[PDB]
Amino acid sequence: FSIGIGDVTPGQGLLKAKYELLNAGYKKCDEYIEALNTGKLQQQPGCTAEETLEALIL
Amino acid sequence: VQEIDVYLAKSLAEKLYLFQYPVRPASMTYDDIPHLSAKIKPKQQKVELEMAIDTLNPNYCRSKGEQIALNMDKQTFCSSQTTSNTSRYAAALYRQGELHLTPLHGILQLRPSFSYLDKADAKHRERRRVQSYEFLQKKHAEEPWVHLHYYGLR
């Protein structure tokens, strides 16, 4: 039983999956930031804006 | 492009001493020409005047009586000087056609002298270091022979 760097390299399917998830996960977080400061953002019941924004970032 | 020229006016500015008032900003208060009993020193001005109080405010009365000394009622001033280096500020009188520079002497602030509570406590008593300098002034404080008057002069 042995480990190697072949056991850590992502295949072809990961890279085209991670590239879209890093893009479509960043389009919304660019908009969710923009929906706060430029205009009106709805608020989660916990706190105001700039606190539930981060909990919606996470 | 107003190219107005600045004269380095040599009209003696040794006489010019700016006076400051961190006391009268409420209603464009002008000190008012009539009051006299003027006393001024050349170094540490200590301007002592006849700032006689009005009587339009209703008499004030007993507390003025309670004051002990009031000589109508002098509201004198002791000059807080700020003359460390005193040529950094030297502006004068400026039309839109001419501009006359004059280099002033040390500016002096003029907050109100009390000395009523100072003397008042002493009165109860009856019932620093080289503070005045080596020569005890023997003069600057003696100099108050003063005449504030109105003359158009440059």
Place this chain on the structure above:
Amino acid sequence: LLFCPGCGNGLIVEEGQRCHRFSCNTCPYVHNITRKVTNRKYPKLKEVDDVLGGAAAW
């Protein structure tokens, strides 16, 4: 805080005949019925939120 023209020692209101006699040299401005106004608007407690069960699953 309204100050004294002449010594500058802050506002004191004597309740005799509506003046502003300071602890120093009297400069009692016997303000007539001019009505004093100092409405320092506070905060207003603002409703509530139900602290819902929309998200707790993650």
